């Protein structure tokens, strides 16, 4: 009785392990991430978040990637040192264990994730996707 | 104000463009596909669907790759040569819209998609992922 949840909360690949894929989030008003492990990893892999803009050369292809300014919660005791927004999966996460995350405030039309410095060779195993849940049109 | 939609409708990479990926669905009770193109296409692509069962080794390794059969609706009235419910992505589709497929009848714990013969070359520009609906832990 599995309904067609393709429409009505679709999903797209964010990070396959080799390259990023900027994805539009305009038509949707909310969204979130999903992380998955394919093999045991050596360190707590880190990732940098970026947001793009509609490039004025063509208002369909995204522009360059800018680091997004995460706003800390009211009791975020430890906040980003200077890496305005980023994520870091804890070490010792095994396969068949999905992970969830999101940012509180967006500032563009395209979101992208990249393996942050020093965690590339371990990011070649984790897969990342994005789920959006808006219609807006 | 995006919610934590990582949990509550997650998602996982299905067909990346190079190699399929068995995804657990025992976990939940309603799931669906989201197809996407990355560039221009050629003669419409064809994808076969496969299901796995718990292998006698890891009681959690998707077993062999057996093909899910086809079931008709009230007026499905349109039947392939065999059963074996597959899908055909029609060409002339731009990387700005998505396709939403969903098999109504499931059997097993690991769904998988494979590029049918005469489509792999044209399927290399296809990105397919699956997202679930329930939690049912």
């Amino acid at each position: 009785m599995n309904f067609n949840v393709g429409v009505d909360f679709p999903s797209f690949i964010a990070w396959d392990g080799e390259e990023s894929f900027p994805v539009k989030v305009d038509g949707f008003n909310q969204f979130g991430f999903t992380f998955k492990t394919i093999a045991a990893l050596t360190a707590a892999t880190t990732f940098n978040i970026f947001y793009h803009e509609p490039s004025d050369a063509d208002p369909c292809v995204p522009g360059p990637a800018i680091r997004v300014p995460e706003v800390p919660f009211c009791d975020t005791v430890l906040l980003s040192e200077d890496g305005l927004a980023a994520v870091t999966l804890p070490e010792t996460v095994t396969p068949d264990s999905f992970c969830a995350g999101t940012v509180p405030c967006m500032n563009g039309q395209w979101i992208s994730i990249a393996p942050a410095t020093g965690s590339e060779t371990n990011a070649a195993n984790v897969q990342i996707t994005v789920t959006m849940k808006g219609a807006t049109r | 104000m995006n919610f934590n939609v990582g949990v509550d409708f997650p998602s996982f990479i299905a067909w990346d463009g190079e190699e399929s990926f068995p995804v657990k669905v025992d976990g939940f009770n309603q799931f669906g596909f989201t197809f996407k193109t990355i560039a221009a296409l050629t003669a419409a692509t064809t994808f076969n669907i496969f299901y796995h069962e718990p292998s006698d080794a890891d009681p959690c390794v998707p077993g062999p790759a057996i093909r899910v059969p086809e079931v008709p609706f009230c007026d499905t009235v349109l039947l392939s040569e065999d059963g074996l419910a597959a899908v055909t992505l029609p060409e002339t589709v731009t990387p700005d819209s998505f396709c939403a497929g969903t098999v109504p009848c499931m059997n097993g714990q690991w769904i998988s998609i494979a590029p049918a013969t005469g489509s792999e070359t044209n399927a290399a520009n296809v990105q397919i992922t699956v997202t679930m609906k329930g939690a049912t832990r």
């Binding site: 995460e70 980023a86 264990s97 992970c99 969830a100 995350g101 | 657990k24 009681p59 959690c60």
Partner: peptide, 28 residues
């Protein structure tokens, strides 16, 4: 700052080596 809920997937059964203290009375 992004959180990381897991509620992981698959479930490995335990097994158990339940004891029922062995049979003896000897002391020497």
């Amino acid at each position: 700052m992004v959180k990381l809920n897991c509620r992981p997937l698959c479930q490995a059964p335990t097994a158990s080596r339940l004891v029922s203290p062995p049979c003896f009375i000897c002391r020497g």
